[PDB]
Amino acid sequence: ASEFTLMPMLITNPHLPDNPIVFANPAFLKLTGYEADEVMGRNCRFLQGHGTDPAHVRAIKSAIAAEKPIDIDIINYKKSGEAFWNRLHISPVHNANGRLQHFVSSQLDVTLELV
Ligand SMILES: Cc1cc2nc3c(=O)[nH]c(=O)nc-3n(C[C@H](O)[C@H](O)[C@H](O)COP(=O)(O)O)c2cc1C
């Protein structure tokens, strides 16, 4: 049966409108309290909320638009509403031919480090 990295991971498909999540591993679903069918097909921004710094969101949007990687700590929210610091690593995935195919991320709850 399936096994995945124990680090939270998402893959999104930028060929679909709004770059939706197409894969979330069980580690991400454990981290955020969501079900796979609640996260797949959505842009990851649903994790943000009233405490999320708009500057962080713009830095991510910028890196994505540039197809560059970004490492950023951002305030996000579990399904329960519980706020946490999410250490986000986002990378584009480019084919050997150079064309953008996916984005992939690592996520980690770093609340205990920052608070
Ligand atoms: C692979 C990937 C993973 C992402 N993971 C998160 C995440 O965990 N939390 C978050 O707030 N945004 C995450 N984002 C960022 C949002 O999807 C979006 O790019 C960001 O909010 C900037 O765009 P917007 O201004 O349209 O919202 C991720 C983006 C990608 C491509």
Side-chain angles (χ1 to χ4, degrees), residues 1-67 69-98 100-115:
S2 283
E3 293 186 60
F4 299 95
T5 182
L6 300 194
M7 185 76 68
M9 168 177 293
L10 297 181
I11 296 166
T12 69
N13 187 349
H15 300 276
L16 305 168
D18 209 18
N19 194 25
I21 300 168
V22 294
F23 168 75
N25 67 357
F28 174 95
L29 297 172
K30 294 218 297 210
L31 164 67
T32 58
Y34 286 96
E35 306 301 334
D37 69 6
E38 288 172 328
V39 310
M40 290 165 74
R42 301 171 82 178
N43 187 281
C44 198
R45 75 170 73 78
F46 73 94
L47 290 175
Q48 296 161 11
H50 288 114
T52 304
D53 191 339
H56 292 168
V57 173
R58 297 188 305 259
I60 295 162
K61 196 222 265 184
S62 183
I64 289 171
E67 305 178 17
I70 186 176
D71 297 305
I72 197 185
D73 299 337
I74 189 172
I75 293 173
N76 275 177
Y77 297 86
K78 304 186 180 209
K79 182 180 172 172
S80 67
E82 174 186 348
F84 74 103
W85 277 109
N86 185 5
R87 175 154 296 161
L88 182 51
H89 171 88
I90 296 161
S91 302
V93 182
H94 286 100
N95 298 151
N97 67 23
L100 175 71
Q101 194 61 240
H102 318 276
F103 290 90
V104 65
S105 60
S106 288
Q107 280 85 351
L108 186 67
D109 189 343
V110 296
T111 301
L112 287 172
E113 181 191 316
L114 306 182
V115 199

